[PDB]
């Protein structure tokens, strides 16, 4: 009696990101908007469980990021029961630490965020 080996992406996000009582003084690079304000993807994404206002901080690099924005990026394509920070590039699923497969090979998809 079991289903959904992995489960859902909505949970994975929180599993790596811990919701904060109140959005910190950080700035979301994913949408380039102040955490204080709603999420930029709020329009594109229409999830019920998650929310645009909702904000949390990771458990690795402790970087604040719109719990929603993270889901949008993960769902966009990277849906392998994992999550990587678009800031410090820290993986939580694949491998917590070293880079993915040594030196990722970006041919068409190459994120440019400092
Ligand atoms: Zn955001
Ligand atoms: Zn980070």
UniProtKB/Swiss-Prot annotation:
Localization annotation: Cytoplasm; Nucleus
Zn finger spans (RING-type): 28-89
Family per record: Belongs to the Deltex family.
Assembly behavior: Homodimer. May form a heterodimer with other members of the Deltex family. Interacts with NOTCH1.
Disease: Recurrent site of retroviral integration in murine B-cell lymphomas.
Task of the protein: Regulator of Notch signaling, a signaling pathway involved in cell-cell communications that regulates a broad spectrum of cell-fate determinations. Probably acts both as a positive and negative regulator of Notch, depending on the developmental and cell context. Mediates the antineural activity of Notch, possibly by inhibiting the transcriptional activation mediated by MATCH1. Functions as a ubiquitin ligase protein in vitro, suggesting that it may regulate the Notch pathway via some ubiquitin ligase activity.
Protein name: Probable E3 ubiquitin-protein ligase DTX2
Organism: Mus musculus (Mouse)
Portion held of the full protein: 389 to 489 of 619
């Amino acid at each position: 009696g079991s289903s959904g080996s992995s489960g859902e992406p909505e949970q994975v996000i929180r599993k790596y990101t811990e919701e904060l009582k109140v959005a910190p003084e950080e700035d979301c690079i994913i949408c380039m908007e102040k955490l204080a304000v709603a999420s930029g993807y709020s329009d594109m994404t229409d999830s019920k469980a998650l929310g645009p206002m909702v904000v949390g901080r990771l458990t690795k690099c402790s970087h604040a990021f719109h719990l929603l924005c993270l889901l949008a990026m993960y769902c966009n394509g990277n849906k392998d029961g994992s999550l990587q920070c678009p800031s410090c590039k820290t993986i939580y699923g694949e491998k917590t630490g070293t880079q993915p497969w040594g030196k990722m090979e970006v041919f068409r998809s190459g994120p440019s965020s400092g």
